[PDB]
């Protein structure tokens, strides 16, 4: 980019003679209301922005100020990585070569290490009458332990 930039002030000035300066903060994982001023980046340090919030937004004047720092020799990036477990039928997997899909018809009743659509563990697989929802590939018990597949 042209230069690193970030918001230094994002406050709501309320009413009267703008004598109350309430700062508007963000919640974890969320965007700022002052990002709409210079979404592509602040041109210069200390730029001043104003906006008139409507009744659907709390009212008052939204003053935003941004700061600009010069670009480095090498672009430096920041990452925030989050993962989830057990919230999907499929999964995201890295390029790990587990081998090839195998069959359980020769191993019924024998404890076998398994990795089924990202869900891994050890257990004994027994042919059963279908219970639970078909599209929901996994049937879990009352303690979030797999009991069907």
């Amino acid at each position, epitope marked *: 980019p042209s230069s690193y930039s970030f918001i230094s002030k994002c406050s709501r*000035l309320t009413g009267d*003679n*703008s*004598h109350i*300066e309430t700062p508007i903060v963000i919640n974890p994982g969320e965007y700022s209301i002052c990002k709409n*001023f210079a979404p592509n980046g602040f041109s*210069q*340090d*200390g*730029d*001043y*922005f*104003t*906006r*008139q919030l409507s009744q659907l937004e709390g009212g008052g*004047i939204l*003053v935003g100020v941004g700061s600009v720092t010069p670009m480095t020799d090498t672009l430096q990036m920041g990452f925030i990585i989050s993962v989830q477990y057990g919230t999907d039928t499929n999964s995201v997997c890295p390029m790990m070569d587990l081998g090839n899909s195998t069959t359980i018809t020769d191993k019924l009743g024998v404890c076998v290490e398994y990795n089924l659509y990202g869900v891994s563990g050890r257990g004994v697989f027994i042919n059963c009458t279908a219970v639970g929802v078909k599209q929901q590939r996994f049937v879990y018990d009352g303690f979030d332990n797999l009991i069907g597949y």
Partner: antibody
Amino acid sequence: EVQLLESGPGVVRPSETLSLSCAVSGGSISDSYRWSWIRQPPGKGLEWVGYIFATGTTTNYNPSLKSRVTISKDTSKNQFSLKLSSVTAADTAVYYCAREPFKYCSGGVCYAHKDNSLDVWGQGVLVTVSS
Amino acid sequence: IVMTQSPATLSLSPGERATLSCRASQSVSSNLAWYQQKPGQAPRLLIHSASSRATGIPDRFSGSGSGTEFSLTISSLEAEDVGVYHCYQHSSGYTFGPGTKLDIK
């Protein structure tokens, strides 16, 4: 267009405070970045006296004024005034009402740099300290 | 800082290449303006950057420069241009220049 006429006395005694009143006649106080005062002693160059933000009560002053200067705004009457305390014969000058404009006021957004060149000035009121 | 203007009293003739010059103690980030003050008049802005001409200014004006040296260049020396030319800087603090002075011959 905004025209800035200002009013006040012309003769101030030593140690007696100096009050000026500059009223804006185009738009309003809240249609600008900040409003500033500029003085100029007779034949001695201009000088920056201070400024007041249009939104908020934040103000800045010349450090060479020893915190003797208070510049306030009153949106009700559409004016912003100046008070300089402990006036001296060395302080006699002509005081210029000024304005620092936004670069654009589009939609509902006004964008101005942190420091901009004064754009529209008043005529100026000539004060003197004497007896 | 301490600004300066070199040509002091640069009297001129109708039709020239009038070139002013305003130097700063330290570099300014192009935050230099030019103001023109007739005898007994509020100062009137001319340029609000290195060469960003302001509204209503005749095209004959074109300043130049950045950092520590600047200039204001006028060719058509018209009688409605005789006066005083300050230079203003807002990069550090807010200060005005010494002030030049021009006249016809």
